[PDB]
Each structure stands twice: as structure tokens, then as C-alpha cells.
């Protein structure tokens, strides 16, 4: 009957996540994570998602995410793509765009900053498992082989970067 329920995707939070934000249209039941995946990039001014992987339903979202204690809840970015990331850098000095979050995956933030209209880069804490945000300047106050850490100075890897 196709329509498998909840596969493993690149980017989940999986550890019950989901994110405050405005479900686009309807939700999708009874889908995978890859399915509303796919969901979100049927549906235009989508930048994350939420899988329910109790209800087994996709709530696409709108932009930036903000995580927060969802039981069975998977959120993530659009794009679990990371062909635009730069891994082991990290800006800190620079002033930020955006608020810090505690996210598994990369993905998170890259939908965070691809959303933001202010937002240029981005970095993700692979130990911590956190965000940050920050804006032009960002060069000056790089930080090349930091252990840990993932950043992006571009939009979706897959749907803009």
C-alpha cells in the first residue's frame, strides 16, 4: 500500500523533540520521517518538520526552529544535508543573529539561519549538541579545526546552499 511509517532519516532529534512553529496546511498521518521529509519540500515556506513517531503524523513548519520536550517527537530541518557545512570551525565572536539552540543534528541550525533573513552562519556544536547564530563579521572571528563543531555559511544544502 506504500507509505511506510517513521523510517530513520539523516536528521532527527529523536530523543522526543518537536518545535514551536506553524503547522503549513494539514498534517501527514501515518508517514516516515524520508515521507514528510518529502512533505515539507511538497509544501513552499517549509524550512523544518515534526514527525510524530507516536502518531505517526508530519507537522510541516515554518521558519526557524524552537525545540522543546515532545514525547515520540522528531523535528528537523528540511535538509539533513551537510555538502554546504563546514566541519571543525566555529564563530563565536561574532555578533549573533539568532538564539542559541540545543539541537542532534546540524540541520536545526541550518534551517534556523536559511530562515532568518538577518542570519549568514551558523554552527553546530557536535558534543553539546547546540546552535549558533551570527551574522556578518563572521570571518574575523573564525575559528578553523575546532573540534566538535559544525557550521554553515549558507542556506539549505539541498533547497538553497
Known amino acids: 500500500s506504500s507509505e511506510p511509517a517513521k523510517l530513520d532519516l539523516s536528521c532527527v532529534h529523536s530523543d ?3 518545535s ?3 503547522t503549513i496546511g494539514e498534517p501527514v498521518p501515518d508517514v ?3 515521507q514528510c521529509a518529502a512533505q515539507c519540500k511538497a509544501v513552499d515556506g517549509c524550512t523544518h518538520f515534526t514527525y510524530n513517531d507516536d502518531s505517526k503524523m508530519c507537522h510541516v513548519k515554518e521558519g526557524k526552529p524552537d525545540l522543546y520536550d515532545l514525547t515520540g517527537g522528531k523535528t528537523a530541518s528540511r535538509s ?3 555538502s554546504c557545512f563546514e566541519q571543525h570551525v566555529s564563530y563565536e565572536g561574532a555578533p ?3 538564539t542559541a539552540m540545543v539541537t542532534s543534528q546540524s540541520a536545526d541550525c541550518q534551517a534556523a539561519c536559511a530562515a532568518d533573513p538577518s542570519c549568514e552562519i551558523f554552527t553546530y556544536n557536535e558534543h553539546d549538541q547546540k546552535c549558533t547564530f551570527k551574522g556578518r563579521g563572521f ?3 573564525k575559528e578553523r579545526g575546532v573540534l566538535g563543531v559544525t557550521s554553515g555559511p549558507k542556506q539549505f544544502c539541498d533547497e538553497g546552499g
Do not use: I, Q, T
Open 96 to 98: 549573533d543573529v539568532m
Open 139 to 141: 570571518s574575523a572571528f
Open 20 to 22: 514551536r512553529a506553524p
Open 16 to 18: 522526543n523533540k518537536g
Open 32 to 34: 516516515s520521517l524520508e
Open 80 to 82: 539533513c544535508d551537510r
